[PDB]
C-alpha cells in the first residue's frame, strides 16, 4: 500500500537532475561536438535526444511513478516473463557503482591535493617526473605533459603497473578518498529519500554554481572565443557519417540514463497524480542544457591553452578522465588565483558524480527493498553491507593498476549492454504490455494521454534507433586498449561476462519463470503477459 514519498517535489527533480547530470555532461558531450562538427552535431544529438532519448527517459519516469515499485518489482508486475529486465537493469547499476565512484575519489584526491600555494602538476621537476615531461599536452605519446605525469605517475602510479594482471600495491591515499566517497554516499542514502532528497540539493545545484564561475573565468580569458569556435563550428560533413549518429545516440542515452532503474526507483516515490510529463521534459532539457553550458566552460579554457600556452587543439581536446584530471587542471595552474579555480573544479567533479552515484545505488536499494521485506526495514544495515562490498572490491581501483581495472569496467560494466536492456524495456511496454494500455496508465496519473508522437517513439522509433545503434557498435567493436597498453584476450572475456551477466537475466529469468508457472501451450504466456492487476 503506502510507501514514503519525497519530502518535497524539488527533492525529486534535483535527484533526477543530479543523477542525469554527471561527468559525461562535461568530459564527453563537449568533446563530441568538437569531434563531430560542432553545432552541426546538435542535429543528430537533438534528433536522438528527441526521438530516442527523451521518450525513453519519459517512459522510465512514468513507469516508476505509476507502478510505485523498484526496478525489479516493477517489471515483475508489468510483464512477469520479462521480470529478468529488472534484474539486468539493477545488476548493471550494480556494476557501474564499482566503476563510477572511483572517479569521485580521484576528484577528492585532487581536491585534497589542491590545498597549497603552488599546484603540484605545474612543473616537470618533481620526483614522479620523467625526462620526457613537457609543460603541456602534445602529440608523441612518449612525452607526457606535467599534468599527465602527475596524474599517471603520482596519483595513479599507473607507471608502476604493467597491465590488469599486475595491480601492484594499494594506494592508501586513494583508498582513503574512496572511503570518504562511500561515507558520503552512505549517509545520503542512509535513511532513504528523506535525507537523500535533501542531500541532492547540494550535489545537484553546486556544479551549476561552479559552472557559472568557470564560465565567466573561462570567457574572460584570452583566446576563449577560439575555443568556443572549435566547440560550436558547424561542419555538417560528419552528419553523413554512421558513427556520429552512433555517438549522438549513445551519449544521449547514457546522459539521460534510462535502463539503470534509477528513473524507475526515483519516480516510484512520486505521488501518483503528479505530472511526470513536465518533470521528464524539464529534466531532459536541464541535463542537455548543462552539457551545452559546460561545453563553453571546457572549451573557453581549452582555447586559452591554444593561444597563450602554445599547444595544439587536438591534444587538449579530450574525453574521459583525461580531460578533467589532466588537461583542464593544466590550464587552471597558469591563470591567476589558480588555487581557487582548482578547489571548486574538483569539488564540482565530485558533486557531479555523487548524485549520479546516489541514483545508481538507490536504483538497487529501492529495487531490492520492494522485492524483499527483509531489506526495507533493515535499510540502514543493508546500504552498509552494499557499500562495504563496494569499498572492499573497489580497493582494486585504488591499486597502482587501478586505472586498468577502472577502464575495463568503464567499457564493459554498462555499455551497449544498457541499450539492449532499454531496448527490452521499450519492446515490453509498447508491444507486450502495449501502448494503449500504457497511455491509459499515464492518463490516470497526469490527466491526459501521451501524444501519438511519444507512442510512435516508444513503439517504433526508439527500438529501431536503439537496435541499429547497438548493432553498429558491435561491428565497430575492437579489443580494449588504454594508451599503448593492450588488454589481454582474457580480460576482454571477463568484461563480456560482466556485460553479459546482467543482460542474460532477461532470457534466464524468463525461461526460469516460464518453466516455473503451472500450465501448458499458449496460455502459459497469458499468465506471464498479464500484468499485476489482470
Amino acid at each position: 500500500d503506502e510507501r514514503e514519498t519525497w519530502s518535497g517535489k524539488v527533492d525529486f527533480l534535483l535527484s533526477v537532475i543530479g543523477f542525469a547530470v554527471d561527468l559525461a555532461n562535461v568530459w564527453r558531450f563537449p568533446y563530441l561536438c568538437y569531434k563531430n562538427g560542432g553545432g552541426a552535431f546538435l542535429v543528430p544529438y537533438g534528433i536522438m535526444l528527441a526521438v530516442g532519448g527523451i521518450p525513453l527517459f519519459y517512459m522510465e519516469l512514468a513507469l516508476g511513478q505509476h507502478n510505485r515499485k523498484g526496478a525489479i518489482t516493477c517489471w515483475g508486475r508489468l510483464v512477469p516473463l520479462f521480470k529478468g529486465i529488472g534484474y539486468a537493469v539493477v545488476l548493471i547499476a550494480f556494476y557501474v557503482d564499482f566503476y563510477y565512484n572511483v572517479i569521485i575519489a580521484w576528484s577528492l584526491r585532487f581536491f585534497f591535493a589542491s590545498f597549497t600555494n603552488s599546484l603540484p602538476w605545474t612543473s616537470c621537476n618533481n620526483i614522479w617526473n620523467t625526462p620526457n615531461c613537457r609543460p603541456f599536452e602534445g602529440h608523441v605519446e612518449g612525452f607526457q605533459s606535467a599534468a599527465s605525469e602527475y596524474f599517471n605517475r603520482y596519483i595513479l602510479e599507473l607507471n608502476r603497473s604493467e597491465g590488469i594482471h599486475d595491480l601492484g600495491a594499494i594506494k592508501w591515499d586513494m583508498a582513503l578518498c574512496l572511503l570518504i566517497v562511500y561515507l558520503i554516499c552512505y549517509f545520503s542514502l542512509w535513511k532513504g529519500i528523506s535525507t537523500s532528497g535533501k542531500v541532492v540539493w547540494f550535489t545537484a545545484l553546486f556544479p551549476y554554481a561552479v559552472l557559472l564561475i568557470l564560465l565567466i573565468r573561462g570567457l574572460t580569458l584570452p583566446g576563449s572565443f577560439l575555443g568556443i569556435q572549435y566547440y560550436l563550428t558547424p561542419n555538417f560533413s560528419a552528419i553523413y557519417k554512421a558513427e556520429v549518429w552512433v555517438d549522438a545516440a549513445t551519449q544521449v542515452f547514457f546522459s539521460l540514463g534510462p535502463g539503470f532503474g534509477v528513473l524507475l526507483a526515483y519516480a516510484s516515490y512520486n505521488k501518483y497524480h503528479n505530472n511526470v510529463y513536465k518533470d521528464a521534459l524539464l529534466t531532459s532539457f536541464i541535463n542537455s542544457a548543462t552539457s551545452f553550458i559546460a561545453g563553453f566552460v571546457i572549451f573557453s579554457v581549452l582555447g586559452y591553452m591554444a593561444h597563450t600556452l602554445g599547444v595544439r587543439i587536438e591534444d587538449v581536446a579530450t574525453e574521459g578522465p583525461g580531460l578533467v584530471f589532466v588537461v583542464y587542471p593544466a590550464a587552471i595552474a597558469t591563470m591567476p588565483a589558480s588555487t581557487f579555480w582548482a578547489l571548486i573544479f574538483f569539488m564540482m567533479l565530485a558533486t557531479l558524480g555523487l548524485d549520479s552515484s546516489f541514483g545508481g545505488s538507490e536504483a538497487i536499494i529501492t529495487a531490492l527493498s520492494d522485492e524483499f521485506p527483509k531489506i526495507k526495514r533493515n535499510r540502514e544495515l543493508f546500504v552498509a553491507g552494499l557499500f562495504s562490498l563496494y569499498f572492499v572490491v573497489g580497493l582494486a581501483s585504488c591499486t597502482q593498476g587501478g586505472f586498468y581495472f577502472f577502464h575495463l569496467l568503464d567499457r564493459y560494466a554498462a555499455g551497449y549492454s544498457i541499450l539492449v536492456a532499454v531496448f527490452f524495456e521499450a519492446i515490453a511496454v509498447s508491444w507486450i504490455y502495449g501502448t494503449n494500455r500504457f497511455s491509459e496508465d499515464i492518463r490516470d496519473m497526469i490527466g491526459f494521454p501521451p501524444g501519438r508522437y511519444w507512442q510512435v517513439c516508444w513503439r517504433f522509433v526508439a527500438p529501431i534507433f536503439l537496435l541499429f545503434i547497438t548493432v553498429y557498435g558491435l561491428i565497430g567493436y575492437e579489443p580494449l586498449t588504454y594508451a599503448d597498453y593492450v588488454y589481454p584476450s582474457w580480460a576482454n572475456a571477463l568484461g563480456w561476462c560482466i556485460a553479459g551477466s546482467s543482460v542474460v537475466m532477461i532470457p534466464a529469468v524468463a525461461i526460469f519463470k516460464l518453466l516455473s508457472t503451472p500450465g501448458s501451450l499458449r496460455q502459459r504466456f497469458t499468465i506471464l503477459t498479464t500484468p499485476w492487476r489482470d
Partner: antibody
Amino acid sequence: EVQLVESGGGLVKPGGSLKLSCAASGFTFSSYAMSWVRQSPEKRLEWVAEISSGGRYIYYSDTVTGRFTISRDNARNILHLEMSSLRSEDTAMYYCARGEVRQRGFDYWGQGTTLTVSS
Amino acid sequence: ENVLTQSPAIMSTSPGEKVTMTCRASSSVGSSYLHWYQQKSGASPKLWIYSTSNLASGVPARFSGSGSGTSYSLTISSVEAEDAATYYCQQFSGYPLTFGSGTKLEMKR
C-alpha cells in the same frame, strides 16, 4: 462526426435494476475515457461514473457507488452503466459524455436518456 | 467532495451588455482542471470553456474565462440572444468530479 446515443431508461420500481447503453460513433472509442453525467429534474448536473479508455480505471460518485456499475465494450463501441437497487433520487437524465483529457473536460455529450424511478 | 457554487443563480441581460458569472470551489482547483459548459433549454450540455481561459470549437470570441484557485469567472463581452442558456462550471482536479450549481442567463427585453 462524433455521435453519442444513449439508449434504455424508463420507469423502474424503486429497488429495481436497469442498464443504460451509449452508442459511440465517429471516433475511436477505445481511445477515449467515457463518463456518465446525470441531470436531475432540478437540472443539477452530477457526475456519476468514469471509465477509462481500456476500462481499467473506474471512478464513482459516492452517491451511486456500489449500486452502479459502468462497463465498456470497445469491440462494438458501446458504453454501459448497470444500475441496481435504484432509488427515487436516481431519477434523472443520464448523459453519455466523452472526454479523455481531464484538462479538456467533456468535449462531447449525447442526447441523453431518461430514467424515472418511481413506485 | 469538492462543491462548486455559481452566482447568480439567474441573470437577465439585454443584448450587447457584458455579463460576468462566478464559480466558487470549496477546495482549490487547478487552473488547468476547471471547465465551463453551456446548456440551452431542452438540449444537451456543450463544452464551452476548458482549462479556464480556452474557448472550445465553434465558441465565439465574445466569451472569455479567467481566475484561479477557488475563484473562477465566465464573461461574455457582448451578449446576444443566441447566448441565452444555463452555464455550468466543472472541476476535473479530483474525484468525485463535480459540476457547479449553474448560472441561468436569460435575455432582458
